[PDB]
RNA sequence: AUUAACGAGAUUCCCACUGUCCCUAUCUACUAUCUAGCGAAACCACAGCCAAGGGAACGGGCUUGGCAGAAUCAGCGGGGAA
RNA sequence: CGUGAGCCCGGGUCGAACGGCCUCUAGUGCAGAUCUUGGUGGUAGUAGCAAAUACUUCAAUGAGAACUUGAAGGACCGAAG
RNA sequence: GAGACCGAUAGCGCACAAGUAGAGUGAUCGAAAGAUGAAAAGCACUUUGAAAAGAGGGUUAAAUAGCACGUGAAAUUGUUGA
């Protein structure tokens, strides 16, 4: 069976991309008969078509660095790349 | 439909015509030359081994710039190859001919590939695009593959008379 | 006949010098070649979980040793019915060192 | 000069054609001159290259800078299990050269010899020499006696058919290397009785060669495959601006003669050539039974010639061996032919009587610092094992 | 005529630096290589071993000699006044 | 048969017109012209199909699956995509 | 209405869905391509193949006329024979 139009229809119904659409590999025969949007959203309620969760992008490593920056860590001359005027302009300091 | 033999009576033989097949003529001519003159069962098995690279078709006429193999020692040549597409088409003809022989009642076990030839077919047209805006032909070389399965003077006279009388 | 055994494949010596981006694909091929030399069956299937185990560390990172379970089974109907096919599974062991061949 | 600045030719014209040797076992092209006064003796032997090592010895050369100082120098170790003699070949002198008149084979040839006569020994019926052994049995071996009488009366050069014992070496090969060795020495009658008595009797390397003898080593060099001009001939590399390749010869010939000549360097095969390296001095003929083969009178450690962890890619040495000075053509595991020198030696270096002082037995698999496992344990103390 | 600054402008020298070089060696990827499939083009009097002679004064063919043994694969850049 | 350009006959294929002789007539005879148009070779199963990092396992479909589809794993574009 | 004309590379560029298809921004440029048989009677049916087709069988005076169709040269190619 060919289910390219099923992932295209399911992507539009569920509001996500085609990369986040899961069609049950053990139910492709019944999925292949879902030729309409009304049938597609019926399969979603039944559970044959599932929207995958987003891939996790955690930020806590950035939070840990910012907290260490607050208490004075990772600030030496070996961690500075821009000029002092770029890191903190004297126009802002005088202002 | 007339075959190139015309001396084999189509009453104790089997035939398969084959025409306009888009397979290399040079490859199929060499594949058929190995099959020529073999038993039907040996020829069918040989072409099955060619598909699996167990034994190789010797390239004799159209073998310029090709490569050597150790499986060409069976036929005494250095250059050998495994024309899978050619051998796959010929197996279809051998199977077709053997089917016709069975329908006619011919004894399949003693059949022999006695006549097989490969003729060129009208080429097919495609283009290739070369440097500096030139265009060159990109030609196919199809073929036809027909196949038939079978299973004194007075002094001399006087000397002869004397020879018989004198000889014991 | 039907027989299953647990095998350790010293995969490190098969991947020595192999081009990166070809190591993981070749590991699949060498497992199939390993299964043939052991059970004498040219038809080797590989469990999808064992595919995950080989591809676990990307295409360049393949485990130095793999502990697999090669099980020679009987083909029922597909293709050559009388043939035997080998099914290779993954043994979920974290210490693939110091083990011998074990008949299951 | 029309060659602006001229240089000597790259390569030697005396080693052409530089092609793969027609053989894998080195061939004795010529044997010594066979003085008729000396007693009968063999003139050649076969061994297997095990590897190289280094030694220390006290030099002895009056007038040299290092006249009485210690020198470090490399040696090559050749594993030589005793050879078996299985045949006798007679040669007659004809106006067209030398011609093999007859060959005599002893009965009871081992499977190592018999494998040399097949390409598929595993599936053969092993019928070699099966009908021949009847010559030794029938008529009290009168057939063999007639052939021996022929050799004595007619032949002027007698050779024995040698045989290696490759089963005693750590090689996967089971075919033995067979060879003809010329019996230089006394009269033709003496040579036949010498060779006949040697039938089926092992011959050790001890009898053929001495400790201070200068020998020639014949083997096939290490193969390199198809290699370019710079590797084969050592020509100058071209400047980096060159368009179509740098490792090439620029001019492969003048306009006339309108041909590429045989004296111009061309890419092709390098290595795997037959070579005869001469003037090699023996340093030690070790015994395969002794447990102190590497022990000298100064280093009294009871250690064997095998380095720690074994010779790399060869194995251990459990047979007689020959320690020869310098490097020799070939690779490890390669069968090598040892032949007596065809020259006369008068140089003090050639006539020098060597006496070893220390033989290295540290591992060649790395930067090994210990010469024996016992020394490693005392230096390192105790481990977790 | 002289000129500070500027210059993917031309030139000389010095310091640093380095395979440019003495003098080359080694490694990796993609080719070349072998296989399955697909599959051109330039060029082509006929063809394709030399030496000397003569000749339109530098021959593959002629003359006199040397010689000369099926079929081929990978390179190569002397010749074909390619 | 004829010195020759050519002519005649026998054998095979083919299916509707054709020839000799005397005069008259001409868009009347090809090996070339880097001739024109069409067709076909050797080269030759040869050069080659090598930029843009990369694919693998199972199952289904099917006569046939590296480049169809689903699932799983591994990757890339990395918001001047 | 005719011809001591041409006869499908000839005769008009066009004997045919020809100033057409196609090319060029445009002015303009501009082809190739006729013939089964008296009559489609254009191969029913069986069998091998996934199929294209093949083998039998049938139509016809003829398939040595099968829509790739009157005859079917040469270049070039395959088999057999010498
Ligand atoms: Mg400011
Ligand atoms: Mg090539
Ligand atoms: Mg060539
Ligand atoms: Mg263009
Ligand atoms: Mg490597
Ligand atoms: Mg010059
Ligand atoms: Mg350049
Ligand atoms: Mg000449
Ligand atoms: Mg010429
Ligand atoms: Mg003449
Ligand atoms: Mg001549
Ligand atoms: Mg040239
Ligand atoms: Mg070149
Ligand atoms: Mg008619
Ligand atoms: Mg004219
Ligand atoms: Mg003409
Ligand atoms: Mg012409
Ligand atoms: Mg022309
Ligand atoms: Mg190629
Ligand atoms: Mg390219
Ligand atoms: Mg923007
Ligand atoms: Mg007719
Ligand atoms: Mg007709
Ligand atoms: Mg026709
Ligand atoms: Mg012809």
JSON list of C-alpha atoms (C1' of nucleotides) in Angstrom, two decimals, chain G residues 4-78:
[
{"chain": "G", "resi": 4, "resn": "A", "atom": "C1'", "xyz": [8.49, 14.35, -77.45]},
{"chain": "G", "resi": 5, "resn": "C", "atom": "C1'", "xyz": [7.90, 17.90, -69.33]},
{"chain": "G", "resi": 6, "resn": "C", "atom": "C1'", "xyz": [8.96, 15.69, -63.74]},
{"chain": "G", "resi": 7, "resn": "G", "atom": "C1'", "xyz": [7.87, 11.12, -61.52]},
{"chain": "G", "resi": 8, "resn": "A", "atom": "C1'", "xyz": [8.39, 10.97, -54.39]},
{"chain": "G", "resi": 9, "resn": "U", "atom": "C1'", "xyz": [16.55, 13.18, -52.76]},
{"chain": "G", "resi": 10, "resn": "A", "atom": "C1'", "xyz": [12.25, 14.47, -59.25]},
{"chain": "G", "resi": 11, "resn": "G", "atom": "C1'", "xyz": [8.33, 18.06, -59.99]},
{"chain": "G", "resi": 12, "resn": "C", "atom": "C1'", "xyz": [6.22, 24.04, -56.44]},
{"chain": "G", "resi": 13, "resn": "G", "atom": "C1'", "xyz": [8.76, 24.70, -49.89]},
{"chain": "G", "resi": 14, "resn": "C", "atom": "C1'", "xyz": [3.93, 21.42, -49.77]},
{"chain": "G", "resi": 15, "resn": "A", "atom": "C1'", "xyz": [1.26, 14.30, -54.30]},
{"chain": "G", "resi": 16, "resn": "C", "atom": "C1'", "xyz": [0.20, 13.32, -46.96]},
{"chain": "G", "resi": 17, "resn": "A", "atom": "C1'", "xyz": [-3.97, 17.29, -40.56]},
{"chain": "G", "resi": 18, "resn": "A", "atom": "C1'", "xyz": [2.33, 22.30, -45.50]},
{"chain": "G", "resi": 19, "resn": "G", "atom": "C1'", "xyz": [3.50, 27.65, -44.98]},
{"chain": "G", "resi": 20, "resn": "U", "atom": "C1'", "xyz": [2.02, 22.45, -40.96]},
{"chain": "G", "resi": 21, "resn": "A", "atom": "C1'", "xyz": [5.39, 20.59, -36.75]},
{"chain": "G", "resi": 22, "resn": "G", "atom": "C1'", "xyz": [9.51, 23.13, -35.13]},
{"chain": "G", "resi": 23, "resn": "A", "atom": "C1'", "xyz": [13.43, 27.61, -34.25]},
{"chain": "G", "resi": 24, "resn": "G", "atom": "C1'", "xyz": [14.05, 32.88, -33.18]},
{"chain": "G", "resi": 25, "resn": "U", "atom": "C1'", "xyz": [12.48, 38.70, -28.64]},
{"chain": "G", "resi": 26, "resn": "G", "atom": "C1'", "xyz": [11.49, 39.94, -33.49]},
{"chain": "G", "resi": 27, "resn": "A", "atom": "C1'", "xyz": [11.84, 41.04, -38.64]},
{"chain": "G", "resi": 28, "resn": "U", "atom": "C1'", "xyz": [11.65, 36.17, -40.43]},
{"chain": "G", "resi": 29, "resn": "C", "atom": "C1'", "xyz": [13.42, 30.88, -41.15]},
{"chain": "G", "resi": 30, "resn": "G", "atom": "C1'", "xyz": [10.88, 26.32, -42.28]},
{"chain": "G", "resi": 31, "resn": "A", "atom": "C1'", "xyz": [11.14, 20.58, -42.85]},
{"chain": "G", "resi": 32, "resn": "A", "atom": "C1'", "xyz": [10.46, 15.07, -42.95]},
{"chain": "G", "resi": 33, "resn": "A", "atom": "C1'", "xyz": [6.48, 12.10, -44.43]},
{"chain": "G", "resi": 34, "resn": "G", "atom": "C1'", "xyz": [3.01, 8.23, -50.91]},
{"chain": "G", "resi": 35, "resn": "A", "atom": "C1'", "xyz": [2.21, 2.14, -52.14]},
{"chain": "G", "resi": 36, "resn": "U", "atom": "C1'", "xyz": [-0.78, -4.70, -47.23]},
{"chain": "G", "resi": 37, "resn": "G", "atom": "C1'", "xyz": [-4.46, -7.19, -49.94]},
{"chain": "G", "resi": 38, "resn": "A", "atom": "C1'", "xyz": [-9.22, -8.12, -55.30]},
{"chain": "G", "resi": 39, "resn": "A", "atom": "C1'", "xyz": [-11.81, -8.09, -50.64]},
{"chain": "G", "resi": 40, "resn": "A", "atom": "C1'", "xyz": [-9.81, -6.92, -43.53]},
{"chain": "G", "resi": 41, "resn": "A", "atom": "C1'", "xyz": [-10.88, -11.92, -45.00]},
{"chain": "G", "resi": 42, "resn": "G", "atom": "C1'", "xyz": [-6.43, -7.25, -40.04]},
{"chain": "G", "resi": 43, "resn": "C", "atom": "C1'", "xyz": [-5.09, -14.31, -37.22]},
{"chain": "G", "resi": 44, "resn": "A", "atom": "C1'", "xyz": [-11.02, -17.44, -33.93]},
{"chain": "G", "resi": 45, "resn": "C", "atom": "C1'", "xyz": [-9.49, -21.32, -30.49]},
{"chain": "G", "resi": 46, "resn": "U", "atom": "C1'", "xyz": [-5.64, -24.30, -27.40]},
{"chain": "G", "resi": 47, "resn": "U", "atom": "C1'", "xyz": [-1.03, -24.04, -24.73]},
{"chain": "G", "resi": 48, "resn": "U", "atom": "C1'", "xyz": [3.75, -21.63, -22.15]},
{"chain": "G", "resi": 49, "resn": "G", "atom": "C1'", "xyz": [4.49, -16.57, -19.88]},
{"chain": "G", "resi": 50, "resn": "A", "atom": "C1'", "xyz": [3.29, -11.58, -14.81]},
{"chain": "G", "resi": 51, "resn": "A", "atom": "C1'", "xyz": [3.30, -9.31, -19.54]},
{"chain": "G", "resi": 52, "resn": "A", "atom": "C1'", "xyz": [5.20, -7.99, -24.25]},
{"chain": "G", "resi": 53, "resn": "A", "atom": "C1'", "xyz": [5.13, -12.09, -26.91]},
{"chain": "G", "resi": 54, "resn": "G", "atom": "C1'", "xyz": [6.24, -17.37, -28.41]},
{"chain": "G", "resi": 55, "resn": "A", "atom": "C1'", "xyz": [4.47, -22.35, -30.23]},
{"chain": "G", "resi": 56, "resn": "G", "atom": "C1'", "xyz": [0.43, -24.81, -32.51]},
{"chain": "G", "resi": 57, "resn": "G", "atom": "C1'", "xyz": [-3.92, -23.63, -35.38]},
{"chain": "G", "resi": 58, "resn": "G", "atom": "C1'", "xyz": [-6.63, -20.69, -38.89]},
{"chain": "G", "resi": 59, "resn": "U", "atom": "C1'", "xyz": [-7.52, -16.33, -43.40]},
{"chain": "G", "resi": 60, "resn": "U", "atom": "C1'", "xyz": [-5.40, -15.60, -48.30]},
{"chain": "G", "resi": 61, "resn": "A", "atom": "C1'", "xyz": [-3.50, -17.13, -54.75]},
{"chain": "G", "resi": 62, "resn": "A", "atom": "C1'", "xyz": [0.60, -15.66, -51.58]},
{"chain": "G", "resi": 63, "resn": "A", "atom": "C1'", "xyz": [2.03, -13.92, -44.70]},
{"chain": "G", "resi": 64, "resn": "U", "atom": "C1'", "xyz": [8.68, -15.46, -49.15]},
{"chain": "G", "resi": 65, "resn": "A", "atom": "C1'", "xyz": [2.05, -9.51, -48.29]},
{"chain": "G", "resi": 66, "resn": "G", "atom": "C1'", "xyz": [0.82, -9.30, -40.46]},
{"chain": "G", "resi": 67, "resn": "C", "atom": "C1'", "xyz": [-0.86, -2.79, -40.30]},
{"chain": "G", "resi": 68, "resn": "A", "atom": "C1'", "xyz": [7.54, -2.12, -38.09]},
{"chain": "G", "resi": 69, "resn": "C", "atom": "C1'", "xyz": [2.82, -4.21, -44.22]},
{"chain": "G", "resi": 70, "resn": "G", "atom": "C1'", "xyz": [4.11, -3.88, -53.05]},
{"chain": "G", "resi": 71, "resn": "U", "atom": "C1'", "xyz": [9.47, -5.53, -54.58]},
{"chain": "G", "resi": 72, "resn": "G", "atom": "C1'", "xyz": [13.48, -5.32, -50.63]},
{"chain": "G", "resi": 73, "resn": "A", "atom": "C1'", "xyz": [20.16, -3.70, -53.36]},
{"chain": "G", "resi": 74, "resn": "A", "atom": "C1'", "xyz": [24.62, -2.13, -50.85]},
{"chain": "G", "resi": 75, "resn": "A", "atom": "C1'", "xyz": [27.28, -0.47, -46.62]},
{"chain": "G", "resi": 76, "resn": "U", "atom": "C1'", "xyz": [27.03, -3.17, -41.72]},
{"chain": "G", "resi": 77, "resn": "U", "atom": "C1'", "xyz": [25.65, -7.92, -38.71]},
{"chain": "G", "resi": 78, "resn": "G", "atom": "C1'", "xyz": [24.33, -13.31, -36.88]}
]
